[PDB]
Design a protein around this ligand. Sequence first.
Ligand SMILES: Nc1ncnc2c1ncn2[C@@H]1O[C@H](CSCC[C@H](N)C(=O)O)[C@@H](O)[C@H]1O
Length: 325
Amino acid sequence: TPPVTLEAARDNDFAFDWQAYTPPVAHRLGVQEVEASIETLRNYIDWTPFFMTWSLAGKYPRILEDEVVGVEAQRLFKDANDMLDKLSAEKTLNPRGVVGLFPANRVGDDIEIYRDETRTHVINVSHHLRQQTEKTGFANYCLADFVAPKLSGKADYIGAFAVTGGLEEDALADAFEAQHDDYNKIMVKALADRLAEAFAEYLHERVRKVYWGYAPNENLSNEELIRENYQGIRPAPGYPACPEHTEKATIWELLEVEKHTGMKLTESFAMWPGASVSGWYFSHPDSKYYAVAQIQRDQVEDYARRKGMSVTEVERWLAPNLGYD
Ligand SMILES: Nc1ncnc2c1ncn2[C@@H]1O[C@H](CSCC[C@H](N)C(=O)O)[C@@H](O)[C@H]1O
């Protein structure tokens, strides 16, 4: 599909009657350190990516009864849960996280995040990109579109989070490495990954039901959570609706992530521990995932201005999304 100008894309933003809508008010404004036990998180694990890591095809639980890999799958599942039992009893891998909710409003392709409900002083800006090709019967989406425009005068909110399967991951994996035990090195890293993703799922439910509080009576099964049968999204920097990784630095500042969790960012803006998830929370009922995809030089240069970066810097961070050489 052919490219459009930045202005043409913005003229085709997500269309919504903000005058008739009351964005749900965040019940708990502020930043809260959290933790979750392995016992708590194991009921929020999505096991299917675990089997994928072990190069086995099929959806859990059906994979256990499969005819070619079911026996192997059952053995992997037993070893995994045996290791979860031990990590749990010995408290040797300890999931940690932090959550925050803030007053927020959209301005253009960005989301202003305010110190307080006066909505004057901006403590941070969450910057977003916009789809920039010809859209047939649909908006040129930008994640900012799911927050009320400041011009509408509607009180709106944004959340963020960072969670990890635990700071101990490297020590446990490295010890299996020193033992030449590649099986259990793979296993403990796969389990840390499951616990991080389970914590992201559990904490998102906590946010919808309690911290933000717009779905207090939600009652979804784990399978329904895996199918994303809830209202709102938790998009993560680096993923297709917000591919620009340096926005993780804004999450780290907003939530004081390292102070509250021990989690760190690298020079490439990768998270440490490896088993880590971070992202935003959007409440809007029409919010959804999509791909920004390829963008043009006008949007790159505008993003650079808004970020305080040179055009050269932004072309490094957005290299995979450049629709030009
Ligand atoms: N287009 C997109 N833009 C931003 N984030 C996306 C995205 N598509 C998926 N995600 C992210 O990926 C997560 C889903 S994958 C994680 C849950 C899954 N049950 C598992 O264990 O693997 C989403 O919650 C969101 O954080």
